[PDB]
Design a protein around this motif. Structure first.
Motif, PDB file in Angstrom:
ATOM      1  N   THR A  71       0.827  -1.200   0.000  1.00 31.63           N
ATOM      2  CA  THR A  71       0.000   0.000   0.000  1.00 31.63           C
ATOM      3  C   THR A  71       0.866   1.257   0.000  1.00 31.63           C
ATOM      4  OG1 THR A  71      -1.908  -1.030   1.030  1.00 31.63           O
ATOM      5  CG2 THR A  71      -1.665   1.339   1.314  1.00 31.63           C
ATOM      6  N   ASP A  72       1.945   1.225   0.772  1.00 32.90           N
ATOM      7  CA  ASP A  72       2.816   2.388   0.843  1.00 32.90           C
ATOM      8  C   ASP A  72       3.661   2.533  -0.413  1.00 32.90           C
ATOM      9  OD1 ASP A  72       1.963   3.145   3.544  1.00 32.90           O
ATOM     10  OD2 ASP A  72       3.053   1.356   4.196  1.00 32.90           O
ATOM     11  N   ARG A  73       4.092   1.420  -1.019  1.00 31.99           N
ATOM     12  CA  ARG A  73       4.828   1.510  -2.288  1.00 31.99           C
ATOM     13  C   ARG A  73       3.945   2.072  -3.384  1.00 31.99           C
ATOM     14  NH1 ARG A  73       7.129  -2.821   0.000  1.00 31.99           N
ATOM     15  NH2 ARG A  73       5.953  -4.491  -1.063  1.00 31.99           N
ATOM     16  N   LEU A  74       2.678   1.666  -3.392  1.00 29.51           N
ATOM     17  CA  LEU A  74       1.723   2.204  -4.353  1.00 29.51           C
ATOM     18  C   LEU A  74       1.592   3.704  -4.144  1.00 29.51           C
ATOM     19  CD1 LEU A  74      -0.826  -0.701  -4.363  1.00 29.51           C
ATOM     20  CD2 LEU A  74       0.101   0.347  -6.425  1.00 29.51           C
ATOM     21  N   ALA A  75       1.383   4.130  -2.898  1.00 31.93           N
ATOM     22  CA  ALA A  75       1.213   5.557  -2.653  1.00 31.93           C
ATOM     23  C   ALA A  75       2.447   6.343  -3.093  1.00 31.93           C
ATOM     24  CB  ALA A  75       0.910   5.821  -1.190  1.00 31.93           C
ATOM     25  N   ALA A  76       3.630   5.799  -2.825  1.00 34.44           N
ATOM     26  CA  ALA A  76       4.869   6.492  -3.168  1.00 34.44           C
ATOM     27  C   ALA A  76       4.980   6.719  -4.675  1.00 34.44           C
ATOM     28  CB  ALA A  76       6.072   5.713  -2.671  1.00 34.44           C
ATOM     29  N   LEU A  77       4.446   5.786  -5.447  1.00 30.92           N
ATOM     30  CA  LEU A  77       4.581   5.889  -6.889  1.00 30.92           C
ATOM     31  C   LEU A  77       3.351   6.500  -7.544  1.00 30.92           C
ATOM     32  CD1 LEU A  77       6.640   2.693  -7.502  1.00 30.92           C
ATOM     33  CD2 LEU A  77       7.316   5.075  -7.810  1.00 30.92           C
ATOM     34  N   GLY A  78       2.455   7.052  -6.737  1.00 34.11           N
ATOM     35  CA  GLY A  78       1.342   7.801  -7.289  1.00 34.11           C
ATOM     36  C   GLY A  78       0.013   7.070  -7.396  1.00 34.11           C
ATOM     37  N   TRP A  79      -0.145   5.993  -6.640  1.00 34.78           N
ATOM     38  CA  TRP A  79      -1.414   5.285  -6.559  1.00 34.78           C
ATOM     39  C   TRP A  79      -1.927   5.246  -5.132  1.00 34.78           C
ATOM     40  CZ3 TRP A  79      -3.922   4.874 -10.812  1.00 34.78           C
ATOM     41  CH2 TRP A  79      -3.277   4.557 -12.029  1.00 34.78           C
ATOM     42  N   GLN A  80      -2.932   6.063  -4.855  1.00 38.36           N
ATOM     43  CA  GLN A  80      -3.493   6.124  -3.501  1.00 38.36           C
ATOM     44  C   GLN A  80      -4.544   5.017  -3.389  1.00 38.36           C
ATOM     45  OE1 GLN A  80      -2.401   8.906  -1.247  1.00 38.36           O
ATOM     46  NE2 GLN A  80      -3.066   7.287   0.174  1.00 38.36           N
ATOM     47  N   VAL A  81      -4.258   4.000  -2.582  1.00 32.52           N
ATOM     48  CA  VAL A  81      -5.155   2.845  -2.493  1.00 32.52           C
ATOM     49  C   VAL A  81      -6.492   3.218  -1.834  1.00 32.52           C
ATOM     50  CG1 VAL A  81      -5.448   0.542  -1.463  1.00 32.52           C
ATOM     51  CG2 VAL A  81      -3.264   1.180  -2.533  1.00 32.52           C
ATOM     52  N   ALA A  82      -7.595   2.775  -2.428  1.00 31.85           N
ATOM     53  CA  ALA A  82      -8.928   3.098  -1.910  1.00 31.85           C
ATOM     54  C   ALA A  82      -9.637   1.901  -1.283  1.00 31.85           C
ATOM     55  CB  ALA A  82      -9.792   3.680  -3.024  1.00 31.85           C
ATOM     56  N   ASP A  83      -9.387   0.719  -1.825  1.00 32.49           N
ATOM     57  CA  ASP A  83     -10.114  -0.471  -1.378  1.00 32.49           C
ATOM     58  C   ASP A  83      -9.317  -1.707  -1.753  1.00 32.49           C
ATOM     59  OD1 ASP A  83     -12.350  -2.789  -1.808  1.00 32.49           O
ATOM     60  OD2 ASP A  83     -13.210  -1.254  -0.496  1.00 32.49           O
ATOM     61  N   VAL A  84      -9.254  -2.659  -0.832  1.00 30.94           N
ATOM     62  CA  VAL A  84      -8.653  -3.954  -1.108  1.00 30.94           C
ATOM     63  C   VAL A  84      -9.534  -5.013  -0.476  1.00 30.94           C
ATOM     64  CG1 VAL A  84      -6.630  -5.419  -0.978  1.00 30.94           C
ATOM     65  CG2 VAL A  84      -6.321  -2.933  -0.888  1.00 30.94           C
ATOM     66  N   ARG A  85     -10.009  -5.957  -1.280  1.00 30.82           N
ATOM     67  CA  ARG A  85     -10.867  -7.000  -0.728  1.00 30.82           C
ATOM     68  C   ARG A  85     -10.828  -8.232  -1.591  1.00 30.82           C
ATOM     69  NH1 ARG A  85     -16.909  -4.740  -1.130  1.00 30.82           N
ATOM     70  NH2 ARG A  85     -15.847  -2.802  -0.474  1.00 30.82           N
ATOM     71  N   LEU A  86     -11.182  -9.359  -0.977  1.00 32.57           N
ATOM     72  CA  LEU A  86     -11.472 -10.565  -1.724  1.00 32.57           C
ATOM     73  C   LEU A  86     -12.912 -10.528  -2.177  1.00 32.57           C
ATOM     74  CD1 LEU A  86      -9.694 -13.360   0.323  1.00 32.57           C
ATOM     75  CD2 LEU A  86      -8.991 -12.367  -1.853  1.00 32.57           C
ATOM     76  N   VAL A  87     -13.149 -10.996  -3.397  1.00 31.73           N
ATOM     77  CA  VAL A  87     -14.507 -11.121  -3.875  1.00 31.73           C
ATOM     78  C   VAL A  87     -14.688 -12.566  -4.347  1.00 31.73           C
ATOM     79  CG1 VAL A  87     -16.270 -10.243  -5.404  1.00 31.73           C
ATOM     80  CG2 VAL A  87     -14.506  -8.679  -4.559  1.00 31.73           C
ATOM     81  N   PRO A  88     -15.175 -13.430  -3.453  1.00 32.07           N
ATOM     82  CA  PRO A  88     -15.454 -14.827  -3.786  1.00 32.07           C
ATOM     83  C   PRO A  88     -16.495 -14.918  -4.875  1.00 32.07           C
ATOM     84  CG  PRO A  88     -15.318 -14.533  -1.415  1.00 32.07           C
ATOM     85  CD  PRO A  88     -15.389 -13.163  -2.017  1.00 32.07           C
ATOM     86  N   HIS A  89     -16.417 -15.998  -5.646  1.00 30.26           N
ATOM     87  CA  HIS A  89     -17.390 -16.310  -6.694  1.00 30.26           C
ATOM     88  C   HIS A  89     -17.567 -15.195  -7.727  1.00 30.26           C
ATOM     89  CE1 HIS A  89     -18.578 -19.019  -3.267  1.00 30.26           C
ATOM     90  NE2 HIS A  89     -18.272 -19.857  -4.244  1.00 30.26           N
ATOM     91  N   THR A  90     -16.452 -14.589  -8.113  1.00 29.90           N
ATOM     92  CA  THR A  90     -16.431 -13.620  -9.206  1.00 29.90           C
ATOM     93  C   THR A  90     -16.558 -14.381 -10.521  1.00 29.90           C
ATOM     94  OG1 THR A  90     -15.077 -11.960  -8.051  1.00 29.90           O
ATOM     95  CG2 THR A  90     -15.066 -11.890 -10.466  1.00 29.90           C
ATOM     96  N   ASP A  91     -17.469 -13.948 -11.387  1.00 29.01           N
ATOM     97  CA  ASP A  91     -17.617 -14.554 -12.710  1.00 29.01           C
ATOM     98  C   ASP A  91     -16.352 -14.299 -13.528  1.00 29.01           C
ATOM     99  OD1 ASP A  91     -18.476 -15.584 -15.161  1.00 29.01           O
ATOM    100  OD2 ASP A  91     -19.677 -13.813 -15.642  1.00 29.01           O
ATOM    101  N   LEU A  92     -15.695 -15.373 -13.958  1.00 31.33           N
ATOM    102  CA  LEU A  92     -14.417 -15.268 -14.661  1.00 31.33           C
ATOM    103  C   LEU A  92     -14.519 -14.472 -15.962  1.00 31.33           C
ATOM    104  CD1 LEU A  92     -12.587 -18.667 -14.083  1.00 31.33           C
ATOM    105  CD2 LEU A  92     -12.015 -16.364 -13.282  1.00 31.33           C
ATOM    106  N   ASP A  93     -15.672 -14.547 -16.619  1.00 31.26           N
ATOM    107  CA  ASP A  93     -15.893 -13.826 -17.874  1.00 31.26           C
ATOM    108  C   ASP A  93     -15.687 -12.318 -17.712  1.00 31.26           C
ATOM    109  OD1 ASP A  93     -16.441 -16.158 -19.283  1.00 31.26           O
ATOM    110  OD2 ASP A  93     -18.618 -15.942 -19.152  1.00 31.26           O
TER     111      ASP A  93
END
Length: 219
Positions: A168-190
């Motif tokens: 998360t901190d490496r992302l922020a350092a390079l210009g990506w401010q993280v907003a959300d991180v989660r697992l999403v079970p049963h995501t349709d692969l398509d």
């Protein structure tokens, strides 16, 4: 540098500028697989300029052949397939994207995102406009045996370890401010990994690690 059917060709700078100007949104898909997913986006959203960027351009040829046809025959004139690696994005792609999507990444792109490797993260940020969302979708089945070589020396990335590994901190350092991180079970692969090899509507699902960030000033 772009696919036109089965062949590579030089992207016309004038046409590129006109296409961007005419678009409601410019979407850059980094890593495309066979790029059927990008094609389906382009078909669903003719007002979007959908730019697929992948160094393994030969894999995308079927998509490119289909996209070059008349609209009545499945053509998608708003799809642009670019042969390039993300760590060395050419200047023509800098600052163009309203949204960046990394869907089912493999190889260096996958390893780069998991480790938060500067050349990959910086490449992703380079193609983005300020405020553009970045959406990363990684299927977690890659951490079940057989684990692909590009991550087999790494521990499974989970929402907790996205923080604890410092990603998360490496992302922020390079210009990506993280907003959300989660697992999403049963995501349709398509939705993140369409293929010409697989019929749509198979019902195939996977648990996906989903990360969203917003393009901000680096450092």
């Amino acid at each position: 540098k772009v696919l036109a059917g089965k062949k590579l060709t030089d992207l016309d700078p004038d046409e590129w500028a006109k296409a961007q100007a005419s678009a409601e949104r410019i979407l850059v898909d980094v890593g495309t697989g066979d790029a059927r997913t990008a094609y389906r986006q382009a078909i669903a959203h003719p007002e979007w300029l959908v730019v697929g960027v992948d160094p393994a351009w030969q894999r995308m040829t079927e998509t490119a052949v289909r996209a070059a046809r008349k609209p009545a025959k499945g053509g998608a004139p708003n799809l642009v397939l670019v042969s390039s690696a993300i760590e060395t994005v050419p200047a023509a792609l800098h600052g163009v994207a309203d949204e960046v999507m990394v869907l089912m990444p493999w190889g260096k792109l996958l390893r780069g995102v998991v480790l938060g490797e500067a050349d990959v993260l910086s490449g992703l940020r380079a193609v983005a406009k300020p405020g553009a969302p970045l959406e990363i979708s990684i299927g977690t089945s890659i951490w079940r045996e057989p684990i692909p070589l590009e991550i087999r020396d790494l521990p499974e990335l989970t929402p907790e370890t996205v923080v604890s590994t410092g990603l998360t901190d490496r992302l922020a350092a390079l210009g990506w401010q993280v907003a959300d991180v989660r697992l999403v079970p049963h995501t349709d692969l398509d939705t993140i990994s369409s293929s010409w090899a697989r019929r749509l509507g198979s019902g195939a699902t996977e648990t996906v690690l989903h990360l969203r960030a917003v393009a901000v000033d680096p450092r």
